[PDB]
Amino acid sequence: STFVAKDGTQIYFKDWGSGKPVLFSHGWLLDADMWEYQMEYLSSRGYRTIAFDRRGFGRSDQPWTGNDYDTFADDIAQLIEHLDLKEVTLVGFSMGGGDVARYIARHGSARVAGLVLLGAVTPLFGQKPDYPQGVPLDVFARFKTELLKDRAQFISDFNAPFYGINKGQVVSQGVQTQTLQIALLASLKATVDCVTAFAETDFRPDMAKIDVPTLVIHGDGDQIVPFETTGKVAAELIKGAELKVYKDAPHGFAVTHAQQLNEDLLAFLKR
Template structure:
């Protein structure tokens, strides 16, 4: 079932809701859409109610200049889950979609959550102790990405193209694959993407990451390129969480079979 859910007057989120059984909910990352989770939908909808969401100003959801921050995205997620009558769910965030999940927890707690999976996102994006913590990247590099790239459509294309080829996957992308990834991002206009980027970089959800991992079963799936820093941070912040290492930032797309298998093992209590 494909549907639209109004989260406030004039703003609708596009949602795909397929399968039946215990619910699993996927939230895409910065400027990306439900389409990135196509292999997860095929797999998990065979045994579970599988829900994927386009956040506001992403994909087929309403483009708006209002609420392009992860506090609002967390509120939106709560409204979607309530309207769909989703209970006892596994929430799966990818990249900045993890911020949406942590913000949901900040606002609503973990009472209605069965388990959590966070795909390749540190709970705090930036730090002056960047050499000793798992963060998105050096402060100067992140500032340059915002200042030099997310100022016009060409800059957004160049930024996503470079990130896709250098960080998202480990093999060389075919032209049509790279074009598809870039087109996903460009559904969000550059001026909204800039808002989301800055909101994400200035987020700090270490408290929610720590507390939620104590309350419910939690899985982190992290990319190989920063696995050492990620494992160190998670082990200190959320020692009860499971950590798996796989591929690049888009590992659930490039290595969908391996990713789905390790999530299955986690959900079945073997993780």
């Protein structure tokens, strides 16, 4: 399905099943397909599942402008309004934890029942003057330099640390190929601008606006988004939040720990 955002951008989404809605926001490089197994799992158990391709990714249009978290959050607001969703459980992976958090911060929680943050960049990813424990901006400047030379090989090399294959996680060649295929659909411009967005955007003000039941899940083997300065902190900053830590799990744990995640999502929903 599609809708058209404020600035004319057509955004692809899937809307499966019936019942209480669960809206998924994917990570960097990926698209709505990264959620296919969670969507099938929950929609065959009485939930409605909705997942969109972020602007510049997957099957959506690729605008030059608006590749920033305020726009991403308003794109989510527009999808929610397009479908007239109510009592939504928002679920964000990696950089997509930021746009579901920013949506609550900008739009409030009247339509929201709950929030799930998976390996998310919340509450802050890159260093700031009062956050020297964050990831040095040097690191993200280098992502951008490498992407602007050869984004295809960058994505391919990123599979190993993303999935923890260099630390004994087992992921098939097929999954690695699908990840690269999906990533290559995206815009080079959006891909690079997202680096700016997740490197530098501070969601700590957002944490204080989250007034719904919240579950944070994160792998403590995560080589991309360090658990100790993101998920661990987000769980403390959000009032009432629950934390689950998947032992030695990588960033790409919706694949390596799919069954565990499916069961944890269902239990959160049934709380």
